[PDB]
Design a protein around this nucleic acid. Sequence first.
RNA 1: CCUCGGUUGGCCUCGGAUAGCCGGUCCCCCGCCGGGGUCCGGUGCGGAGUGCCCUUCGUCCUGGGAAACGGGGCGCGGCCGGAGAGGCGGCCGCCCCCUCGCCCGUCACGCACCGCACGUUCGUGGGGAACCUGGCGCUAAACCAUUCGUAGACGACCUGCU
RNA 2: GAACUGGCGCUGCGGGAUGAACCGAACGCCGGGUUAAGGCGCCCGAUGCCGACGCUCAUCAGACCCCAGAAAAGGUGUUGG
RNA 3: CCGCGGCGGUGCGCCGCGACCGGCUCCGGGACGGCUGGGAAGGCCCGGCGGGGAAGGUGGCUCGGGGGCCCCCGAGUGUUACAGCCCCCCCGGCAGCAGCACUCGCCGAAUCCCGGGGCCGAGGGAGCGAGACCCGUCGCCGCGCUCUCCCCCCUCCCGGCG
Lengths: 175, 109, 201, 123, 139
Amino acid sequence: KASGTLREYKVVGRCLPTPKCHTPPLYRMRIFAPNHVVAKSRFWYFVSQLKKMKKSSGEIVYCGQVFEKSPLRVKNFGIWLRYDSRSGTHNMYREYRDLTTAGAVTQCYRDMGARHRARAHSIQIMKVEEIAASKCRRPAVKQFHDSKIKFPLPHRVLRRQHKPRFTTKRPNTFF
Amino acid sequence: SGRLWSKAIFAGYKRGLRNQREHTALLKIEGVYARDETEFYLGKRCAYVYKAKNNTVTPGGKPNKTRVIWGKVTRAHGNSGMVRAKFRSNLPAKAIGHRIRVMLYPSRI
Amino acid sequence: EVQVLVLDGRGHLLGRLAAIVAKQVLLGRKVVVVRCEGINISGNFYRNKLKYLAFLRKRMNTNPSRGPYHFRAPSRIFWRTVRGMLPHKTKRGQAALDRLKVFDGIPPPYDKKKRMVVPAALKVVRLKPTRKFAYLGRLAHEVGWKYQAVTATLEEKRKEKAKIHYRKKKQLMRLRKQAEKNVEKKIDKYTEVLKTHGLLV
Amino acid sequence: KQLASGLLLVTGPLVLNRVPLRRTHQKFVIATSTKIDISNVKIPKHLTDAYFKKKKLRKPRHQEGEIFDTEKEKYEITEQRKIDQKAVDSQILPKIKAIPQLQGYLRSVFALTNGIYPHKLVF
Amino acid sequence: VFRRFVEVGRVAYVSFGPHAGKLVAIVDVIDQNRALVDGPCTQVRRQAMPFKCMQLTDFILKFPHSAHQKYVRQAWQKADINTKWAATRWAKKIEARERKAKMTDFDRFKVMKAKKMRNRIIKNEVKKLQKAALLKASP
RNA sequence: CCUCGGUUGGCCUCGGAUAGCCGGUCCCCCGCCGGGGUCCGGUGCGGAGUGCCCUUCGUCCUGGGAAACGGGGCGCGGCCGGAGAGGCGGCCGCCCCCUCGCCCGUCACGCACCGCACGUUCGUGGGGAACCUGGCGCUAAACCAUUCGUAGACGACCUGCU
RNA sequence: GAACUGGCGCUGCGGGAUGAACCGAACGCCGGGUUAAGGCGCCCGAUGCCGACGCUCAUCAGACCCCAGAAAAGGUGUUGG
RNA sequence: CCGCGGCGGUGCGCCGCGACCGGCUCCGGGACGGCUGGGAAGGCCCGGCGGGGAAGGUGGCUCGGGGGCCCCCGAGUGUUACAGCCCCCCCGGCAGCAGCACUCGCCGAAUCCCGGGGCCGAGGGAGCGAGACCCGUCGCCGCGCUCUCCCCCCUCCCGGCG
Ligand SMILES: [Mg+2]
Ligand SMILES: [Mg+2]
Ligand SMILES: [Mg+2]
Ligand SMILES: [Mg+2]
Ligand SMILES: [Mg+2]
Ligand SMILES: [Mg+2]
Ligand SMILES: [Mg+2]
Ligand SMILES: [Mg+2]
Ligand SMILES: [Mg+2]
Ligand SMILES: [Mg+2]
């Protein structure tokens, strides 16, 4: 699985009605995939691991994006995920602050890739919750819970280094 | 009493790393350092002006030592000005890092 | 630019400065880089010195006189770095090399000119503040350069002459600031038009 | 006005910049954003392209060219052109005199310096 | 040092990006890189914007963090920013930077003629100030 | 005359910091100029290189504004500054000129070459033989040969000769 | 020394600096356009994007299939769990 | 034989410019519609009757720090106060609607118009009709007008014109 800006898909599936249980149970899951094609394929991967059913012995009954309920309020997300490193695999819990839950999972994929070098195919996210700041655990997020939060912007590095590329005056950083 | 043409530099023919196609030339125009700026110059006529020993007839004038290889700008070449152009006869390699005028000819303005 | 382009190597990063210069000289545009002893190289001083001490050890053992020429002056050090970025073995590259000029300090055809600085190669913007760097001039003096002291003296003498020029410029600019303070009614209709057009906010 | 052949009939106010009633190509000129309203001016009907078409003389009954045609090398301004220029300019000069310092603007010659570039310029 | 900080209710100027040149006041801070900015009266709706684009200004509003949009616009209306800014020295500086770009060919002629006199009157009169300064022969 | 082509306005300079800078002023102290400390401003730099300066159609009537204390003369004579690669720059006195040149106006003309490109500068370019033209000037060395042996395979080197 | 498929031999071209076999792709002589694998500081065509998020300081740093150099075991160096 | 004659084809001695038409391609504007959770949120109507909740804790309080017992900062206080936030509403109303306030999609029988840059011009007797006769301005396809009559608005050799 590659990435992009991740999108949360709810996928509902079931086995074909065999003439033994004409109404098989319906199964719903939350898949985070770049598009509905990948989301459907990821659905069978988790379901076949979970319960004895294959894509051939089943079908998708619904696959639609889950728009963020409150994409205009900052919130803290707690992601429970497991992944396999070069050694054996591990269970892990991380916290992120973002407007959209898909944006949090994207952050988790990059943060996991940046720190533990875990490629996206190595990661399985099992749980994503909206976590209240009082219940947050990571100090990286706890430091952002303050009504009178205050910080300057110390080093403003020049980013227009080539417009112009030649100029008599050296830039200044403090503002 | 006026420069009347844009000043550009012959940067080299279009090429890969080991294959070069002399039938198009890459010109860097001073003042354009992005793709979107190149839209102005995308059709204009570019001229390479040089001198020689023998005199050559000059239209609207007396014979002189100046000769010109004409051409016109085709399309932008990559993310920062440096548009690519085609000439009637492929430019000599001695003109690399020399002046090519962009002559403000047929204007869409 | 038809005129030669003078650059102040003080505060500049060796490779970052040379890569810009090498392209700038491959397209004509004669270029001069003054104050080569002010160039900075990223990384702590000791590890950069070892990098040059390694280069001293590269030498044709059968006949070192034909081996690599380890130039010691900071200008020659910077000039050699550009030489690696150009096709010096081809005619086009050799011609580009001749367009370049490198100087320690600022000799006196160039100190009377407005120096230029490239931001894409500045140590202030390209290096994190909590990183150790090294001066080219100090490194050169420690690998064989014999003119750290004399250049520093001559450079200081140049700086004092510049201050006199700068005090005169401020004197004449203050005098001009007073001037527009005097002529106000004979200028108001000319100031205003430039104000409608963005000049002199 | 633009002519029937597509060539733009333009004039310089001859007393100002030495450009008479003359055609010019549309694609070979730069149109600026500065306009002067020339409504209710009278353009004579006899200014077709056939008027400004170049007249040619040589070569009537000369096959072997040895005695050179040293005459007609001077294109003469026909008096008819003189009156037309004065007629059209008569009603256009006082109108351009209204907007300030247009004459000096039109007397000047457009040019590029070692600063500005044409793409950045808004004409 | 550090005259201005990133507070809740701090007005910043969006230098580059989709809303380049607009004005905006942040509502909340996120992950040290993005801020919940929102400008109701500057025609930029509430959204997350990175800290790398905006330009910090001395203007500060007072309202609770994560306040709803109705509270920001009234705090923007009272002690209104578009008149303090825009008739602040920074704003007329960039807007005059805009006027220079829009200048047409005829305008460029008038400025060139006007600037010719402008410097002519200065240059021919500074020579009177220097010659007036030459009367210095005291011990 | 033979040959080489480039280019198509100039910027005449603080030192530098970046978790800071820039400009201005009132008091103290360095042999009537600088250095400190207060105070005042600007700081997405506007005393801004995203900047500044010049800007060219030429003239003729013709007024209004700028200036008159000015310009241009390779015209002269003299002074001063710069040594890192000064190869440069600045300033006084004399003499010719005109209120001309810079903005806004009045007035009309110039080949207006009839749609067309290499146009426009640097530039009186660099280089090579040569004629005329005036003035001011100078009248030498090297190598061979011959000696020397502080030198030497030959060259080379050290040497001497009204 | 065998099995299946492909290739080299018989094969040029783009990339891997370099290379019979790898990756892309197979070839009449050309113009335009677009790609593959691979790349876009400079050599060297192309990121001269106000690219996004983090990690990392090395007194032998690291830098891309085949591939051209490394292990067991350690660190109160830092990061996450 | 002459006309700088026309009509046909065939050309230009070199160097060029332009026009529309068509094929191919890369881009740029402008507008329309569908679907979705018959979009999610969101904006205005101080949202009105409220109920409930907590803290990234408003006001008010307590202790500790400064400026002329008065005014600002920090730390504990909780439920609305001299701020706010979230859920449930008994119910909402209006506008717009994947927004020309650029938060987040997939699409076009639910899709059309206009423009720009570049390369190209290959081919050469298409006349079922007259019995071709100046040269086929022709097939397919899409159109317009006339062999029907009225009106309406600019006009026009106009007819005198005020
Ligand atoms: Mg093969
Ligand atoms: Mg064999
Ligand atoms: Mg075979
Ligand atoms: Mg290869
Ligand atoms: Mg290799
Ligand atoms: Mg091709
Ligand atoms: Mg490469
Ligand atoms: Mg390149
Ligand atoms: Mg729509
Ligand atoms: Mg044909």
